C-alpha cells in the first residue's frame, strides 16, 4: 500500500497499519491544525500503549516538530527519572515527510474533559490538586532556564480521565467528576531557553500576558500568568479573557484586575493603546459594549465565601499581577496557604 496524504498534508491513517515496522495503529485520538494523534501498540516494547503525534507533511510543521523533538531531548536530560509531570517522548521518526513523536498514552486533555461535561466547572478540590501539579511541573522547567510560553487547558492532560456521573445537587442535571485528578503537561514545541531567541509575541491569545501585548519582553512569568488564566477557567468553566484583539484584551484586564501600572505604560512602544496616560477605546463599539457588560472585578467571580475560595482567589490575583517582576513565582506559589487543603496523597504525589 502507498503512503497517502490528504489535501492539507495529513497522513491518511488506517487501523492495522504499522509504522517503523513497530507501531500498530489501533485508534484515532484526534486531529488538529498540526496533524493528528493516533493510539498505537508498540510491538518492539511488549505491545505497550503509545500516543503517536503524526505531523502534517508541510515544511513549516516539519521544522516545528524537529524543534519540539530537540526541546524534548533537553528536558529528558534534566529529568531522567521522569518525576516532574512532563509528557516526554519515547521515540521520534520521520515517516515519509511526516514527523512522528511517540508518547505515553494519557486520557482526555483538561479542555476536552471540561467540554464533555458541558462546561460545568471542576470542583475546588480538583482545581487545587491540578494547580499544585502545574506549579510543581513548571517550577522545575523554570529552575532549568526554560519557559513553556503556550500553557492552556488543551496542553494539560489527565493521566486517566475515567469519571463518575453524579446528579448535580443544585442544578437540574448530571455532572461528570474525574476519578483521579493526576495531570501531565505537554506540548513543548514553543518552549524557549533563557539563552535562545525570544520572539516578540508568544502564547495563545486568551492566556497571553500584558508584557507580551505591550512588547516589553518576557520570561518565565509569562507562564505564571497563563496558569492564573487556566485556574480561573477550571473553576468557572469559562475563559477569563474571551478576546480576539489587543485593545479589547487590555480593557478586559483593566476591568477585571484594575489599572495597568503607569510604569509599564511609560515604557511600552505600543502607545496606540493609550491617550493621556490611560487606555483609549470606543465604549460604543461591539467590543466596547461587550466588555462593559461582561467583564467584572475578579473577586465577583467567586462561587462561595469560604476560606478555601478566598485563598484560591488570592493566589489567582497574584498570578495575574500586571508587572511580571512583581508577579508571584511558582516557587512562592507552592508555599501559598491555598495548598494547605491538599490531602497527604495529593501533596506527596501518590495519586
Ligand atoms: C500528543 N498530545 C498533544 C498534541 C497537541 N495537543 C495538545 C492536542 O492535539 C490537543 O488535542 C488532543 C490531544 C491529544 C489527543 C487528542 C486531541 O485532540 C482533541 C480530542 C478530541 O477532539 C479533537 C481534539 N493528546 C494525547 N492524547 C492521549 N495521550 C497522549 N499522550 C501525549 C499526548 C496525548 C499529547
Distance CA 104, CA 134 (A): 19
Residue pair 82/88 in contact (Cβ under 8 Å)? The answer is yes
- 35 φ/ψ angles, rounded to the nearest 5 degrees: 145, -150
Q: Which residues line ligand 1 (CB under 6 A)?
A: 29-30, 32, 37, 51, 53, 87, 103-106, 109, 112, 154-155, 157, 186-187
Q: Experimental method for this entry?
A: X-ray
> Is 29 annotated as contributing to ligand binding?
yes
3-state secondary structure of 338: helix
- Residue of the nearest CA to atom 25 in ligand 1? 37
> Is 217 annotated as contributing to ligand binding?
no
Residue pair 296/256 in contact (Cβ under 8 Å)? The answer is yes
Q: Is 150 noted as a catalytic residue in this protein?
A: yes
* Domain 1-82+87-105 bears CATH identifier 3.30.70.100: no
Catalytic residue (one of 5, 6, 79, 150): 150
Q: Ligand 1 centre from 221 Cα, in Å? A: 26
Closest listed residue to residue 89, CA positions, set 68, 62, 115: 68
CA dihedral defined by 154, 157, 158, 163, rounded to 10 degrees? 30
What's the Cα-to-Cα distance from 5 to each of 26, 98, 260, 328, rounded to whole Å?
19, 10, 49, 46
State which ligand 1 atom lies nearest to the alpha carbon of 52: 1
> Is 34 annotated as contributing to ligand binding?
yes
Q: Where are the domains of the chain?
A: 1-82+87-105, 83-86+106-351
Quick one: DSSP state of residue 34?
T
Q: Ligand 1 centre from 37 Cα, in Å? A: 6
Distance CA 314, CA 307 (A): 10
Distance CA 216, CA 2 (A): 50
Amino acid at each position: 500500500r502507498s503512503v497517502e496524504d490528504d489535501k492539507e498534508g495529513h497522513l491518511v491513517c488506517r487501523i492495522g497499519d504499522w509504522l517503523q515496522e513497530r507501531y500498530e495503529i489501533v485508534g484515532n485520538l484526534g486531529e488538529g491544525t498540526f496533524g493528528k494523534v493516533v493510539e498505537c501498540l508498540d510491538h518492539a516494547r511488549g505491545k505497550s500503549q503509545v500516543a503517536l503525534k503524526i505531523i502534517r507533511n508541510v515544511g513549516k510543521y516539519r521544522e516545528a516538530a524537529r524543534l519540539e523533538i530537540n526541546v524534548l531531548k533537553k528536558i529528558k536530560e534534566k529529568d531522567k527519572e521522569n518525576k516532574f509531570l512532563c509528557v516526554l517522548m519515547s521515540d521520534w521518526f520521520n515517516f515519509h515527510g511526516h514527523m512522528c513523536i511517540a508518547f505515553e498514552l494519557l486520557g482526555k486533555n483538561t479542555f476536552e474533559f471540561l467540554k464533555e461535561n458541558n462546561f460545568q466547572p471542576y470542583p475546588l478540590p480538583h482545581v487545587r490538586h491540578m494547580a499544585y501539579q502545574l506549579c510543581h511541573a513548571l517550577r522545575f522547567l523554570h529552575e532549568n532556564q526554560l519557559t513553556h510560553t503556550d500553557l492552556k487547558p488543551e496542553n494539560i492532560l489527565f493521566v486517566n480521565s475515567e469519571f463518575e456521573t453524579l446528579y448535580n445537587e443544585h442544578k437540574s442535571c448530571e455532572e461528570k467528576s474525574v476519578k483521579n485528578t493526576s495531570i501531565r503537561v505537554a506540548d513543548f514545541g514553543s518552549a524557549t531557553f533563557d539563552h535562545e531567541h525570544h520572539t516578540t509575541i508568544v502564547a495563545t491569545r486568551h492566556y497571553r500576558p500584558p508584557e507580551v501585548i505591550l512588547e516589553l519582553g518576557w520570561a518565565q512569568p509569562c507562564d505564571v500568568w497563563s496558569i492564573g488564566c487556566i485556574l480561573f477557567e477550571y473553576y468557572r468553566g469559562f475563559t477569563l479573557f474571551q478576546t480576539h484583539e489587543n485593545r479589547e484584551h487590555l480593557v478586559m484586564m483593566e476591568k477585571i484586575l484594575g489599572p495597568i501600572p503607569s510604569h509599564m505604560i511609560h515604557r511600552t512602544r505600543k502607545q496606540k493603546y493609550f491617550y493621556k496616560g490611560g487606555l483609549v477605546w470606543d465604549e460604543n463599539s461591539s467590543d466596547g459594549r461587550y466588555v462593559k457588560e461582561n467583564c467584572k472585578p475578579l473577586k465577583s467571580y467567586m462561587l462561595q465565601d469560604s476560606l478555601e475560595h478566598v485563598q484560591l482567589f488570592d493566589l489567582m490575583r497574584r498570578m495575574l499581577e500586571f508587572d511580571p517582576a512583581q508577579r508571584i513565582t511558582l516557587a512562592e506559589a507552592l508555599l501559598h496557604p491555598f495548598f494547605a487543603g491538599l490531602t497527604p496523597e495529593e501533596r506527596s504525589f501518590h495519586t
